[PDB]
Amino acid sequence: MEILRTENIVKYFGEFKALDGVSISVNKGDVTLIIGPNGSGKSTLINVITGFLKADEGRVYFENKDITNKEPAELYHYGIVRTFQTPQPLKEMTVLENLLIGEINPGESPLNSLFYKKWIPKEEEMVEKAFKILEFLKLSHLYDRKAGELSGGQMKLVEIGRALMTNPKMIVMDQPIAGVAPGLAHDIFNHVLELKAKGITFLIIEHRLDIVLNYIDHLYVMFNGQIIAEGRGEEEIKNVLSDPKVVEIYIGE
Numbered sequence: 001m002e003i004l005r006t007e008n009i010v011k012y013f014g015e016f017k018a019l020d021g022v023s024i025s026v027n028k029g030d031v032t033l034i035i036g037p038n039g040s041g042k043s044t045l046i047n048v049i050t051g052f053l054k055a056d057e058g059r060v061y062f063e064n065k066d067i068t069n070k071e072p073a074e075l076y077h078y079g080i081v082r083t084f085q086t087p088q089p090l091k092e093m094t095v096l097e098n099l100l101i102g103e104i105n106p107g108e109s110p111l112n113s114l115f116y117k118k119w120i121p122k123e124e125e126m127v128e129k130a131f132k133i134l135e136f137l138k139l140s141h142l143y144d145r146k147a148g149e150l151s152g153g154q155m156k157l158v159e160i161g162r163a164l165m166t167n168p169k170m171i172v173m174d175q176p177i178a179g180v181a182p183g184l185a186h187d188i189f190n191h192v193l194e195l196k197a198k199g200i201t202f203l204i205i206e207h208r209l210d211i212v213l214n215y216i217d218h219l220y221v222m223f224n225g226q227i228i229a230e231g232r233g234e235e236e237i238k239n240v241l242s243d244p245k246v247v248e249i250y251i252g253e
């Protein structure tokens with residue numbers, strides 16, 4: 001049931017301690033969200049897990065396999081992928097190409113994958129997969145469209161599509177719907193549930209709780225680098241959100 005766990009993960013940035021012995025467990029097929037005020041190490045944590053950051057101490061286990069500090073190219077073979085915010089160079093490219101760059105160095109980010117330049121492979125095999133995904137996402141009609149011309153929610157959906165290009169078992173997303181209009185937002189998360197349905201596990205960071213909350217089935221709250229609250233399920237979550245210590249981290253300067 002548990003697909004991912006971290007055992008006392010530590011990360012340092014100089015002398016500052018961004019993370020502080022963070023341990024978390026995530027069950028297969030779950031949609032796990034982590035929240036906390038800016039500066040709590042949510043991102044750093046996510047980056048460590050996805051392999052874009054090195055864990056100074058502690059470990060990460062995927063399906064009970066020690067994967068600590070493996071490069072994203074390697075984690076790709078394990079079924080882990082992170083969604084990447086789209087850079088400007090990619091915005092000049094079509095929606096199809098944006099899914100296609102996920103093929104060059106599977107698991108690696110768009111720019112560490114675009115080291116290959118205009119060599120965005122347009123090989124029949126990959127493209128068919130890109131379309132199959134654009135299809136599932138109900139975006140094939142925008143396959144030829146320059147990504148920079150899409151709405152924020154549209155762009156977010158494309159990024160999810162770029163990740164699916166790696167047939168992941170788990171998708172890690174840092175703020176999938178920030179700046180996305182409510183209707184498109186629920187739609188994005190709708191597709192997540194659609195994916196949860198096929199057995200895909202999610203680890204998400206978000207700040208707009210007024211939308212997201214109805215979709216997550218595992219919450220974690222973080223402050224100063226450590227897990228300061230957990231709550232599995234609707235009821236526990238309502239409690240977690242009620243708890244005054246949580247509200248307080250958001251008030252007082």
Ligand SMILES: [Cl-]
Pocket residue numbers: 052053054
């Ligand atoms: Cl590092």
Ligand SMILES: [Cl-]
Pocket residue numbers: 178179180208
């Ligand atoms: Cl927002």
